[PDB]
Design a protein around this motif. Structure first.
Motif, PDB file in Angstrom:
ATOM      1  N   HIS A  91       0.866  -1.164   0.000  1.00 14.88           N
ATOM      2  CA  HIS A  91       0.000   0.000   0.000  1.00 14.88           C
ATOM      3  C   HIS A  91       0.909   1.223   0.000  1.00 14.88           C
ATOM      4  O   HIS A  91       2.143   1.093   0.083  1.00 14.88           O
ATOM      5  CB  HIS A  91      -0.956  -0.069   1.210  1.00 14.88           C
ATOM      6  CG  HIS A  91      -0.176   0.058   2.472  1.00 14.88           C
ATOM      7  ND1 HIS A  91       0.354  -1.037   3.142  1.00 14.88           N
ATOM      8  CD2 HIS A  91       0.253   1.160   3.115  1.00 14.88           C
ATOM      9  CE1 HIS A  91       1.034  -0.594   4.191  1.00 14.88           C
ATOM     10  NE2 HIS A  91       0.968   0.762   4.202  1.00 14.88           N
ATOM     11  N   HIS A  93       1.365   5.625   1.288  1.00 15.15           N
ATOM     12  CA  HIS A  93       0.979   6.804   2.051  1.00 15.15           C
ATOM     13  C   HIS A  93       1.402   8.004   1.221  1.00 15.15           C
ATOM     14  O   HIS A  93       2.434   7.915   0.548  1.00 15.15           O
ATOM     15  CB  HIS A  93       1.744   6.866   3.387  1.00 15.15           C
ATOM     16  CG  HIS A  93       1.513   5.653   4.226  1.00 15.15           C
ATOM     17  ND1 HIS A  93       0.475   5.567   5.124  1.00 15.15           N
ATOM     18  CD2 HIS A  93       2.132   4.455   4.241  1.00 15.15           C
ATOM     19  CE1 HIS A  93       0.505   4.366   5.705  1.00 15.15           C
ATOM     20  NE2 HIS A  93       1.517   3.670   5.182  1.00 15.15           N
ATOM     21  N   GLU A 103       6.134   8.759   5.351  1.00 17.44           N
ATOM     22  CA  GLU A 103       6.054   8.536   6.783  1.00 17.44           C
ATOM     23  C   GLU A 103       7.473   8.614   7.318  1.00 17.44           C
ATOM     24  O   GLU A 103       7.739   9.402   8.215  1.00 17.44           O
ATOM     25  CB  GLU A 103       5.464   7.155   7.039  1.00 17.44           C
ATOM     26  CG  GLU A 103       4.095   6.980   6.385  1.00 17.44           C
ATOM     27  CD  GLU A 103       3.230   6.068   7.237  1.00 17.44           C
ATOM     28  OE1 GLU A 103       3.528   4.874   7.293  1.00 17.44           O
ATOM     29  OE2 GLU A 103       2.267   6.567   7.867  1.00 17.44           O
ATOM     30  N   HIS A 116       4.803   0.750   0.918  1.00 17.82           N
ATOM     31  CA  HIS A 116       5.098  -0.214   1.967  1.00 17.82           C
ATOM     32  C   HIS A 116       4.805  -1.606   1.404  1.00 17.82           C
ATOM     33  O   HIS A 116       3.653  -1.869   1.059  1.00 17.82           O
ATOM     34  CB  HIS A 116       4.260   0.076   3.228  1.00 17.82           C
ATOM     35  CG  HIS A 116       4.789   1.254   3.986  1.00 17.82           C
ATOM     36  ND1 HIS A 116       4.096   1.882   5.026  1.00 17.82           N
ATOM     37  CD2 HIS A 116       5.994   1.871   3.899  1.00 17.82           C
ATOM     38  CE1 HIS A 116       4.833   2.892   5.463  1.00 17.82           C
ATOM     39  NE2 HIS A 116       5.996   2.891   4.813  1.00 17.82           N
ATOM     40  N   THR A 195       2.474   1.569  11.394  1.00 20.25           N
ATOM     41  CA  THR A 195       2.384   3.026  11.452  1.00 20.25           C
ATOM     42  C   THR A 195       0.917   3.483  11.440  1.00 20.25           C
ATOM     43  O   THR A 195       0.646   4.688  11.387  1.00 20.25           O
ATOM     44  CB  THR A 195       3.075   3.693  10.244  1.00 20.25           C
ATOM     45  OG1 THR A 195       2.371   3.336   9.060  1.00 20.25           O
ATOM     46  CG2 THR A 195       4.513   3.262  10.033  1.00 20.25           C
TER      47      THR A 195
HETATM   48 ZN   LIG Z   1       2.114   1.678   5.475  1.00 19.27          ZN
END
Ligand SMILES: [Zn+2]
Ligand SMILES: Cc1cc(C)nc(Sc2c(F)c(F)c(S(N)(=O)=O)c(F)c2F)n1
Length: 257
Positions: A91, A93, A103, A116, A195
């Motif tokens: 996925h 962010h 992140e 990720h 996270t």
């Molecule tokens: Zn993630």
């Protein structure tokens, strides 16, 4: 319920998930001048040739491509890892604009996005059980910078219009995650956490030094997704990142320099 807004965002998480304030939270700022070169670290082994993607979905927090992790098809080993970790999903962010979205940060620099690739330790049998363990998960972190397009990301970006809102999903086969990797596998590594809630401290982080370049057009398609379900108030899925968390007692190791 948790999210990324003023009222339910990262600063609120500790109320439902007290480990939010624990000793090994992620992400962190990676201080490049302070990371310890560990010549004893092995090369990362990323064996993704037999990977089998199944579906893509909008879960209201991000979008996720799920893999068939019922056999040893796409595994990460070596580097700082003992044993074998199986790829279950990836996925991203990302930000409301190009100057934020990652992140992890590098010397305080924020990237436009972070990929990720999430793997679980085969000795635990399943991703669920793995997440209950200190060495349960290995997440391969890849930074995205905005510039030239990543051709291997295009298949992902072209289907996002079909999963605009929370709880929409689609079949998504024959996607090759090798097309999302940069040339180099030099990495930093450190012990940390999921996270997002439930924030379990079950992750060995492996964050690649070299970003991939994606185009503005590619990232703009991420920013067209919605956090809300269809027929709820429109809220663009952007800024779905958790800020850097204090390092506390941990050392970040480097595979290079
Ligand atoms: Zn993630
Ligand atoms: C492997 C697993 C098992 C269970 C029960 N939830 C999750 S939820 C989850 C999560 F909360 C995360 F924060 C992450 S992340 N952003 O890569 O650290 C993740 F991959 C996740 F899959 N993940």
């Amino acid at each position: 319920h948790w999210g990324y807004g003023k009222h339910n965002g990262p600063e609120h998480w500790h109320k439902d998930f007290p480990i939010a304030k624990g000793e090994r939270q992620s992400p962190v700022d990676i201080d490049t001048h302070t990371a310890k070169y560990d010549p004893s670290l092995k090369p990362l082994s990323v064996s993704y040739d037999q990977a089998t993607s199944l579906r893509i979905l909008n879960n209201g927090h991000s979008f996720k491509v799920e893999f068939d992790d019922s056999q040893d098809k796409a595994v990460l080993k070596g580097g700082p890892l003992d044993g074998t970790y199986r790829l279950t999903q990836f996925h991203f962010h990302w930000g409301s604009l190009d100057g934020q979205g990652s992140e992890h940060t590098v010397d305080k620099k924020k990237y436009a996005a972070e990929l990720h690739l999430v793997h679980w330790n085969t000795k635990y049998g399943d991703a669920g059980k793995a997440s209950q363990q200190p060495d349960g998960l290995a997440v391969l972190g890849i930074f995205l910078k905005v510039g030239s397009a990543k051709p291997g990301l295009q298949k992902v970006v072209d289907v996002l219009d079909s999963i605009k809102t929370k709880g929409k999903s689609a079949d998504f086969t024959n996607f090759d995650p090798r097309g999302l990797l940069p040339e180099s596998l030099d990495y930093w590594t450190y012990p940390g956490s999921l996270t997002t809630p439930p924030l379990n401290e079950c992750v060995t982080w492996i964050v690649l030094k070299e970003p991939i370049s994606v185009s503005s057009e590619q990232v703009l398609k991420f920013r067209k997704l919605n956090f809300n379900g269809e027929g709820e108030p429109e809220e663009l899925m952007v800024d779905n990142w958790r800020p850097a968390q204090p390092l506390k007692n941990r050392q970040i190791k480097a595979s290079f320099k």
